[PDB]
Amino acid sequence: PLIVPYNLPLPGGVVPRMLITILGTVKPNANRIALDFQRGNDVAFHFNPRFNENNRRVIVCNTKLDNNWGREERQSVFPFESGKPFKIQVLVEPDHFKVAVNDAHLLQYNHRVKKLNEISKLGISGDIDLTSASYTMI
Numbered sequence: 631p632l633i634v635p636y637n638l639p640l641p642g643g644v645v646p647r648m649l650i651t652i653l654g655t656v657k658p659n660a661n662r663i664a665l666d667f668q669r670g671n672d673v674a675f676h677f678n679p680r681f682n683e684n685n686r687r688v689i690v691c692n693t694k695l696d697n698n699w700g701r702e703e704r705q706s707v708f709p710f711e712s713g714k715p716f717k718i719q720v721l722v723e724p725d726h727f728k729v730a731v732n733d734a735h736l737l738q739y740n741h742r743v744k745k746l747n748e749i750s751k752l753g754i755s756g757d758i759d760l761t762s763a764s765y766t767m768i
């Protein structure tokens with residue numbers, strides 16, 4: 631397994647047709663997972679499954695600019711389960727990040743950070759065993 635938190639450099643940032651795949655297993659009794667696509671200190675795309683927010687499961691997505699979080703986008707479809715292996719695929723498209731979990735479309739997140747070629751790091755954190763994190767162009 632890879633160390634968590636894990637930093638995956640994205641050389642030259644992201645670009646449409648780049649597919650980022652995260653394989654891992656959720657820990658028992660998980661509380662949260664986070665993916666943070668970073669442009670320097672900014673977070674262009676934060677993808678945050680929360681396993682117990684007031685006894686509900688939700689995926690929170692947002693952007694952090696100058697240390698301020700913006701308006702959240704919430705998705706109640708929640709494909710993760712404690713103890714189970716998952717695959718997260720993030721496909722960069724011209725207008726949004728497109729996320730599929732376990733081969734099923736989950737959500738899209740419109741680009742708020744415009745300089746895609748400066749989104750040069752992905753941090754992977756939270757209550758997972760991380761197997762692999764990689765990218766390819768499709």
Ligand SMILES: COc1c(F)c(F)c(C(=O)N[C@H]2[C@@H](O)[C@@H](CO)O[C@@H](S[C@@H]3O[C@H](CO)[C@H](O)[C@H](NC(=O)c4c(F)c(F)c(OC)c(F)c4F)[C@H]3O)[C@@H]2O)c(F)c1F
Nearest residue numbers: 662663664676678690691692699700702703704755756757
């Ligand atoms: C792996 O471990 C970590 C992790 F996974 C993380 F995500 C984080 C992290 O930075 N999390 C922050 C990040 O996820 C951020 C994204 O917006 O949200 C905060 S918590 C956040 O705190 C805000 C106030 O400071 C608000 O309370 C946020 N809630 C809402 O905007 C919100 C709400 F409160 C209503 F009641 C709504 O009901 C309709 C609603 F829609 C809301 F969006 C509430 O979601 C989290 O603390 C972290 F630090 C970790 F260490």
